[model samples]
Target: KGEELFTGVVPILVELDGDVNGHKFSVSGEGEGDATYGKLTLKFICTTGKLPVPWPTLVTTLVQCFSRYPDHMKQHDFFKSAMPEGYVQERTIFFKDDGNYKTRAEVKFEGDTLVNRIELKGIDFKEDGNILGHKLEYNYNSHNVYIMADKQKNGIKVNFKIRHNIEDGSVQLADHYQQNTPIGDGPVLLPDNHYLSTQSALSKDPNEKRDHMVLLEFVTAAGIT
Candidate 1:
């Protein structure tokens, strides 16, 4: 797909997930956009043009910023002041990676210290036939938040670990997650919670998700499977 990813965007993705996107989200001398979606301010630095490196350190730096700064970003100028002189957040959008069209919304951040949703949208089906509870309407915080692509087929979904009347075929929000690492404390931006997380059958106080099987451990390094 993105062969030049290694040299261009591969590094950007990697910074976010792994060595995949390789921090391609950050681009220099480019205009950026900050989008807010219900407590999550996703800053996207879109780039179609090129430079010496396909992916820049800016994107990687950003991933580090979010992962590290878990405190209130609204009150502080962190949202507005995080980017360096040469970097910028080009755009932000709600991306449901379900092999279908992504529903994007234009939003502006005002005086609020947190990201707020200006527009709500659903993907694949125009109606709310395939969306989750949180996506349908934001009222009460549920045990999960995800998107269901195709009920018949398990295409792509995020928060699928829960089993409280929730199935694996639906997507859930990536909220309240523990460090899958041995030390189990990460995002890797902050060092205060740093340390090798011990391995065991970790449980949560408000456990909502379920684990059918775990093929990973600390030893695998790449993660056991």
Candidate 2:
């Protein structure tokens, strides 16, 4: 139901060991008041036997996500050019209808087992068309990012350019969001060779302009109402 649709953050991390893949995944986001937000999480799982345990579960979840609420996505202010009607009619900062928000970036990958740079947009919006509220970004390729094996870096780094509705010299809700682990279920990776990237990062497709637009079987679509 729509109940699971807006349940944003949960704040918890449990390490899973052994078997097909032993990797750590973390997610976090920023939302309403000091209580609402959007976040990003990335993980690494070493495959052993033949089954991608966590991955399969992840795929099933997204399949249901898109099949059910493909159109209501744009309803989310973070992704679309506009939020659904009545979301915030008082402010022009958020302008647009609940259309299927699109991603504005290129995706690429390396050899048999090497990849980096997971960038996506629409998760964080810039009220002024220049600054973003929540960084619409998430990465699984940065070593500096947090991982279960490595608890040194502040788990995950949450920073944004901030919106304009606040003020020229306004104060942000949270001063420097620096933490590891996720507040809820992290983003789900698809069967297609694309990982969900937060608005915080920029996506560059090296295979495109460089190799005549030959990105892998890229499937970067997320369905969350």
Candidate 3:
């Protein structure tokens, strides 16, 4: 019965076969869900040597995947284009690092309902100074850095937190830090990386809005015919 569409379990599978910054990287994940939403996680594996994949490149690829999923699902009959059109509502880029200069970064794009977040941890940033404006400085301490953009607020917020500062002789080892910046024509400069653009144009146009779809392409791509 059609009731299954609302109550039955749907299979979810998705794969990202692509290259990032001259490094071949593939992502795949599987999960289960019912009609409206699916909770699936992905793993990014570098096919090449120990050389890590670039975080910005991975982020860009994920954004492209989401922006194209709605139309991409329409090509498959099973979905009937049931995958909702993804519009960027909030975009966040977070980076963290441990001692020995080992680093990690994550990018997340969220719509009113859909969530697309991709992260690659335990990797190292490029040695070239160009990739990162400057390296994070800490002595055997941990820190969290990120830049976030909000469409509804039409503004960008930046935050950096130091989990433990061995040199500082204060009890406030875990102090919260933040900066509020308005979205302008130019990107704002954060600590590790430079400014990330947060413009309203990233959101879906009102004229092109549609209802949330039932099945995510991940489920369809998982061979759920």
Q: Can you give the TM-score per candidate against the true fold?
A: 0.20, 0.18, 0.26
RMSD of each: 19.4, 21.1, 17.4
Residue lDDT tens for model 2, 60-157: 01101111113333232221111111011100112121111121111111221111211111223333332222221211111111112112421222
Per-residue lDDT tens digits for candidate 1, residues 154-216, read 111222122111133444221211111111111111121121111112112243232111111
In the predicted model 3, the residue pairs found to clash are none
Overall lDDT per candidate, in order of appearance: 0.20, 0.20, 0.28
Backbone steric clashes in candidate 3, count: 0
Model 2 lDDT-worst window of ten: 83-92
Off-target runs (Cα >4 Å) in candidate 1 are: 1-112, 126-225
lDDT of 3 by residue, 1-225 (tens): 111232334443433443323444455433343433322223223333332332222322232122111223323211111223222222222333321121121222122222333332322334442223222222223233344433343333444343322223421122222323222333322222222111110112245233111212222122111
TM-score order of candidates, top first: 3, 1, 2
Superior by lDDT: candidate 1 or candidate 2:
2
Best-matching candidate per TM-score: 3
Q: How does model 1 fare in lDDT?
A: 0.20
- Ranking of predictions according to lDDT: 3, 2, 1
